[PDB]
Symmetry: C4
Subunit: 164 residues, 4 copies
């Protein structure tokens, strides 16, 4: 029996009617790998009303993604408000982890000015983790030009961690 | 030594009496894949009202949540409205928004599917915040609109899974 | 670089002094599979009374939960009732209801197994809600019925695992 | 003729929406990429159920303590080098305890002949692991109260156990 495609994404809800395999011992390895990923996504999601948030769920902000949203706010296109960009920034911070930044920080010569930005981003990541609503509120208070700098730095760090 | 079948499903509870391998470094890859699945199931389960207890009975277990809901829609197998609403909460828990958003994005604008996708998305998010509340709302819907909503959710569930 | 054996079991704590690979992209698949298992064990552990401390002593550790329970049933190895009830809570935690429901469904109606399966299922669910409460209930049972219940739970545990 | 997996998705969730040309579809990924992602995701799940409230903690995030690691920090405190305070060493010890698990120590304890003096250390470390798991802030406070020489002994024993479990 082939693996049940519902079970591959989580739990088959079709009871005894379902004729596919729900028995992990007989599944090929690829299906067991795919299911772990869907399940990890669900577990992570299950352990995660503010201005600008609902806008990120609309058709064009979905297509932009959090990065497109933030890059758009920087270039003042696609109608991204500041509120939305701050919410998006919180989402970006949630996706980063400190340890990867510390690793970058450690490759810097001392008194490199990058070190200051790395530490700023690290503190944003930690604030965001403690209280993202608070962190978002702080971000909205920043002058536009410094917000955009901060975003841009965070975006550059996000790209560089991922190509190393 | 072959991997211990108890350890493959979680944790071997047989202490030193057990002669099988509890050492993941010597397991074949297939057994380490199977165990990860049983362990994820357990981790997910470990972080989880009228009509609920009924879903644990022999025939509702055989129907599954989808059988229960489909049965309610066709008024067979003695499924009460209360039970169907609980079962609907369980279906919503199994879905995720992001998959619906992805479907929503394939729609041409002003497609009437978009309205249903957004309705289901809001039910998923309510259910995640407070499933007891979401269930109570569902019980208040007129039977015919409840059945519509269930049916739409079921259809979305099926189509996500065949793409 | 070979994978770091500390990272394989969790997180390497040796900073930059460690010369082994902490980069998953370069690991062989077996090491990535082994690490997932150690990390799942850690995640599960991180989201977890009279007779409890005894189960951590040298000989109860060697017996395992099942040894402890089997010992209590045969009145050997100095297992108190309190301990056996704690150990029973741990056995219940390791079982899951769905597997029992599957067994229950293979039974002809009015089979006396059905009554035991449902009893075990309700114990599993009580234990999941409140294991301290479930342990207290177990302590209140007459020895002879406790031993029956334990034995039934042990038999179900063995049969689910050989099918 | 198909798409390579998205490197962002491999480390978590791609945040580039539809602009991204790489595959976000696990059904078409090679197994190695699915294996790598599971590891990044488990790290994230574990991190998300976890201190800068407490003295000595913030110091462990600085450039040189990061390079030393927890083990370097503890070994440095023992040898009185690299400017590790007692406070920091206690925080680091809490982190080391978090990484260990009791069951492995119990297994070591079971290999010992009775009245072996190792048994006493194994049980001390086991109780530290369990205290730390219940309340790490409390455990850290206790550790700060120990006389330096007994703290260093305890740290050293814990380090040795940590090494030996990992080479068996
Ligand atoms: Zn199925
Ligand atoms: Zn075993
Ligand atoms: Zn290492
Ligand atoms: Zn991508």
């Amino acid at each position: 029996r082939n693996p049940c495609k519902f079970e591959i994404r989580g739990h088959c809800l079709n009871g005894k009617r379902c004729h596919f395999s729900h028995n992990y011992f007989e599944w090929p390895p690829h299906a067991l790998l795919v299911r772990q990923n869907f399940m990890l996504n669900r577990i992570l999601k299950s352990m995660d009303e503010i201005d600008g948030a609902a806008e990120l769920d609309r058709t064009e902000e979905y297509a932009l993604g959090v990065v497109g949203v933030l890059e758009s706010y920087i270039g003042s296109i696609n109608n991204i408000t500041k509120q939305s960009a701050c919410v998006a920034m919180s989402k970006l911070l949630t996706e980063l982890n400190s340890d990867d930044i510390k690793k970058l920080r450690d490759n810097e010569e001392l008194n490199s000015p990058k070190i200051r930005v790395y530490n700023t981003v690290i503190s944003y990541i930690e604030s965001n983790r403690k209280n993202n609503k608070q962190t978002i509120h702080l971000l909205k208070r920043l002058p536009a030009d410094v917000l955009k700098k901060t975003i841009k730095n965070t975006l550059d760090i996000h790209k560089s961690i991922t190509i190393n």
